[PDB]
């Protein structure tokens, strides 16, 4: 598929697609690079995450627009407009699930198993939690609890390694905690745990800022501000 292009060319192209805001192309170039079978560097894992986060973020935003329409069509006094809204929300939903499944497949074949350093292992497990969480945002049936639990288990393993192996200010640790806190708040119906996790994470990071260079400080304070934005919204 991208099988005949050199890994470095795929990487170069993914960077060009990002510059061009062509995130679907970016994701396909990164998928091809992962499929070459070599581990990803830090910068390459970032590219992979950015590409898919943008693709799925477009699909999730569209799904929410369509979901909200579909719900309004189901309220008392609404005209029957036929199956179209449901069908089209399903179409977008199916495409979004396919993207989640593609990323989860890349993580399982074979990113996670070959990731030995904390920074790589936690990064990929956070991705695993994030894409199960996007599956949970749309899940409505028999498997919903198991999808939620898959997101939980992945975030939890990433939390456990990050706590042991990374400083409290590490951006990956902070972003992981931010997302696991969102998972608690809006997926697992645990707003208390979400608040507690965002607070503890923010405070432990504040206390370690003194160890950092100016650039590291800026990196960490940026995600800390996201934790604060959520705490402000939720309290």
């Amino acid at each position: 598929a991208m099988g005949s292009m050199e890994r470095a060319s795929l990487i170069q192209k993914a960077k060009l697609a990002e510059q061009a805001e062509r995130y679907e192309d970016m994701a396909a170039f990164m998928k091809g690079a992962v499929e070459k079978g070599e581990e990803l560097s830090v910068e390459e894992r970032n590219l992979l995450s950015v590409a898919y986060k943008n693709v799925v973020g477009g699909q999730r935003a569209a799904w929410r627009v369509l979901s909200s329409i579909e719900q309004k069509s189901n309220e008392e006094g609404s005209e029957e407009k036929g199956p179209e809204v449901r069908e089209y929300r399903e179409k977008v939903e199916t495409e979004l699930q396919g993207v989640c499944d593609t990323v989860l497949g890349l993580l399982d074949s074979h990113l996670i198993k070959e990731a030995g350093d904390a920074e790589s292992r936690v990064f990929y497990l956070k991705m695993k939690g994030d894409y199960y969480r996007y599956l949970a945002e749309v899940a409505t049936g028999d498997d919903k609890k198991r999808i939620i639990d898959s997101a939980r288990s992945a975030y939890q393993e990433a939390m456990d390694i990050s706590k042991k192996e990374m400083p409290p200010t590490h951006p990956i640790r902070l972003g992981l905690a931010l997302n696991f806190s969102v998972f608690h708040y809006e997926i697992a119906n645990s707003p208390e745990e979400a608040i507690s996790l965002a607070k503890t994470t923010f405070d432990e990071a504040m206390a370690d800022l003194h160890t950092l260079s100016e650039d590291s400080y800026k990196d960490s304070t940026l995600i800390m501000q996201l934790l604060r934005d959520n705490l402000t919204l939720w309290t």
Partner: peptide, 6 residues
Amino acid sequence: KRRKSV
């Protein structure tokens, strides 16, 4: 204002 994720 939508909650933040990263």
